[PDB]
Amino acid sequence: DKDEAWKQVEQLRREGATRIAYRSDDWRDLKEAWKKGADILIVSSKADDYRARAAAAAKELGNVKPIVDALLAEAKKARDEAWKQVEQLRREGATEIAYRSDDWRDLKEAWKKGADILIVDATDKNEAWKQVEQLRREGATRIAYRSDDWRDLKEAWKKGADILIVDVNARIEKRRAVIEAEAAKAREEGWKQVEQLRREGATEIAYRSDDWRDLKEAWKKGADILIVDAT
Numbered sequence: 455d456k457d458e459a460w461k462q463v464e465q466l467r468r469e470g471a472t473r474i475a476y477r478s479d480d481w482r483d484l485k486e487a488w489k490k491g492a493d494i495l496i497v498s499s500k501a502d503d504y505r506a507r508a509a510a511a512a513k514e515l516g517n518v519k520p521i522v523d524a525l526l527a528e529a530k531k532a533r534d535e536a537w538k539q540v541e542q543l544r545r546e547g548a549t550e551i552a553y554r555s556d557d558w559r560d561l562k563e564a565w566k567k568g569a570d571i572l573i574v575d576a577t578d579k580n581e582a583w584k585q586v587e588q589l590r591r592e593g594a595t596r597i598a599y600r601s602d603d604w605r606d607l608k609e610a611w612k613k614g615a616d617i618l619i620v621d622v623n624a625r626i627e628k629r630r631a632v633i634e635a636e637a638a639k640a641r642e643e644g645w646k647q648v649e650q651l652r653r654e655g656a657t658e659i660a661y662r663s664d665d666w667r668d669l670k671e672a673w674k675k676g677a678d679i680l681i682v683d684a685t
Contacts, residue, residue, distance in 0.1 A: 456483055459684040460490050465666040466680055467491030471673060475552070475660065475681035481539035485546050487682070494571065494679065495543055496552040499536035501560070502575075504529035533560060537567045544568035552598065558585040562592055571617060573598040579606060583613050590614040598660070604647040608654055617679065620647040620672070621662040641668055645675045652676030 459476070466474045467490065475494035476487035484495040508525035512518050540551050544567075553564035554573035561572040572594050576582035579601075586597050590613075598617035599610035602625060607618035622644035626637055644661065651659050652675070660679035661672035669680035 455684070456486070459664065459682055460487055462664065462666040462669070462682045463487045463490040463492045466669060466682075469666075469670065471669075471680055473679045475679050477681060477683040477685065479536070479539065479685075481542040481546075483684075484539070484543055485548070488543070488546075488548055492682065494550045494552055494681075495548050496554065496571075496573070496681070496683075497536050497539045497543070497564075497569070498554050498685075499532045501529040501533035501536065502556045504532060505557070537564060540564055540567045540569050554598075554600070556585075558588050561585075561589060562594070565592075565594055571596045571598050573600060573617075573619070574615070575600050579609075583610065586610060586613045586615055600662075602644070602647065604650045604654070604656075607647070607651060607656065611656060617658045617660055618651060618656050619660040619662060619679075619681065620644050620651070620677070622647070623662055623664075623683070641671075645672055648672050648675040648677045 463474055474492040475496055476492040477496035477498055478484045479498055488495055504525050508522050511521050543551050551569040552571035552573055553569040554575050555561050556576045565572055572589055574582050574585045576585055589597055597615045598619055599615040600619040600621045601607050602622045622640045626640040629636055648659055659677050660681055661677040662681045662683050663669050664683055673680055
């Protein structure tokens with residue numbers, strides 16, 4: 455939980471890591487990691503999930519109106535809460551707020567609320583690349599993209615994305631001793647993505663994990679941002 459994840463930020467700062475990231479939904483939890491040494495504070499909301507599930511519910515048979523409104527109402531409350539966390543962290547002194555979403559207009563509003571790093575996390579590659587281009591034309595400077603393939607991050611790099619997040623903790627969770635063996639096979643993959651991105655010349659490479667030794671090793675391979683993710 456909290457005190458177990460905060461120990462990861464303290465260790466990276468202990469070992470001389472100058473770019474540490476932390477992901478949470480509570481601004482108080484993010485502020486504490488900010489004092490532990492994390493410079494990028496990532497706010498995440500369940501709003502994309504509620505929108506995805508409201509969209510799936512609309513394609514079912516029968517009366518869908520009361521259920522769709524209930525899901526979209528929760529999405530509004532989830533995003534209006536995340537925007538509050540961005541303001542509160544800005545109110546506290548946090549300089550590098552990040553926000554992840556699959557809707558670029560939610561990213562644009564978070565950018566006006568105080569977020570500096572915009573994380574596009576659209577599953578469709580051509581849908582994400584369009585969201586980058588749309589954010590670029592609005593004047594957004596720091597666009598981040600998340601993928602488990604380095605070639606997707608290089609293509610996103612050439613579209614305007616400055617931060618390239620290597621995330622492989624989504625395929626291991628889907629495939630699932632033994633369970634720890636498959637986790638290691640994914641970490642060996644994620645470390646290779648960072649290596650080739652450094653070879654290709656990627657300037658700002660990030661890496662998602664929850665263990666400081668995994669972020670340390672990805673830091674050895676060439677990761678510039680060590681993201682600590684509690685969820």
